[PDB]
Design a protein around this ligand. Structure first.
Ligand SMILES: *CCS(=O)(=O)c1c(F)c(F)c(S(N)(=O)=O)c(F)c1NC1CCCCCCC1
Ligand SMILES: [Zn+2]
Length: 256
């Protein structure tokens, strides 16, 4: 029902999802002069099992890669967390132009796209569906993607998109460790926030990497060539899916 278009996009979401105007909404601009270093943060540790890669799915507004989440084979730990979070998905956001496709910004600087690697709290909760609405339920690593050289690490993913061109299509996507997509250093910022699209629950601990990764102009074009319509209907490109930044409302962004 909601989308990213003028009629149903971010500026309209608060009508059906009032929490859009809440105190812990994402994404945010990270003003580096205002970050606070927390001596209790530990380094991030990611430990993903490539055999957990399962399927790629076109969901109309975006696409994602899911990973088997029945057990703790693939986990994020460290950082601000006291226990491990289980990997379940990764996806991207992009924009209509290379100039602004990221959701998070840094000192007002907009990147071309953004990678999200999503996990849920399997220490405290027993399912993604339980964890999704809890303040401590989800942990998402964000990586800002700077347009420039083509990124070869994206290749398996981009090559798969031909199999999921229209809304609802899905295909097997196996033997893939998405830590291969992360930057070499996992220095990061963390703040309490939300899902960036409806239902916008304030359930996400964000881990935003200090270091960016690359993406080419033509790789971004491949994202925008996915279609938001169902097969047989007239082709409608998925041109953009990034939410604008939202007020900090007194939250602190912590620096590792
Ligand atoms: C196919 C991607 S998704 O499942 O629609 C999805 C998404 F596109 C996102 F942008 C987020 S975000 N930006 O806040 O990480 C996301 F979490 C997505 N997945 C969730 C699953 C977790 C709870 C269930 C309901 C909302 C979508
Ligand atoms: Zn996202």
């Amino acid at each position: 029902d909601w989308g990213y278009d003028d009629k149903n996009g971010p500026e309209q979401w608060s009508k059906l999802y009032p929490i859009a105007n809440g105190n812990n909404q994402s994404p945010v601009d990270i003003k580096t002069s205002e970050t606070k270093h927390d001596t209790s943060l530990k380094p991030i540790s990611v430990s993903y099992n490539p055999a957990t890669a399962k399927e790629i799915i076109n969901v109309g507004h975006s696409f994602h890669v899911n990973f088997e989440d029945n057990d703790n084979r693939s986990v994020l730990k460290g950082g601000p967390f006291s226990d491990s979070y289980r990997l379940f998905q990764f996806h991207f956001h992009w924009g209509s132009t290379n100039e602004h496709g990221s959701e998070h910004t840094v000192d007002g600087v907009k990147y071309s796209a953004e990678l999200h690697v999503a996990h849920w709290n399997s220490a405290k909760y027993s399912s993604l569906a339980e964890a999704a609405s809890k303040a401590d339920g989800l942990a998402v690593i964000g990586v800002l993607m700077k347009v420039g050289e083509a990124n070869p690490k994206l290749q398996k993913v981009l090559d798969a998109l031909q199999a999921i061109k229209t809304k609802g299509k899905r295909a097997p996507f196996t033997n893939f460790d998405p830590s291969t997509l992360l930057p070499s250093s996992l220095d990061f910022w963390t703040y309490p926030g939300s899902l960036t699209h409806p239902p916008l629950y304030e359930s996400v601990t964000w881990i935003i990497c200090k270091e960016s990764i690359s993406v080419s102009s033509e790789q971004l074009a491949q994202f925008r060539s996915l279609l938001s319509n169902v097969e047989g209907d007239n082709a409608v490109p998925m041109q953009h899916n990034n939410r604008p930044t939202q007020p900090l409302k007194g939250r602190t962004v912590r620096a590792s």
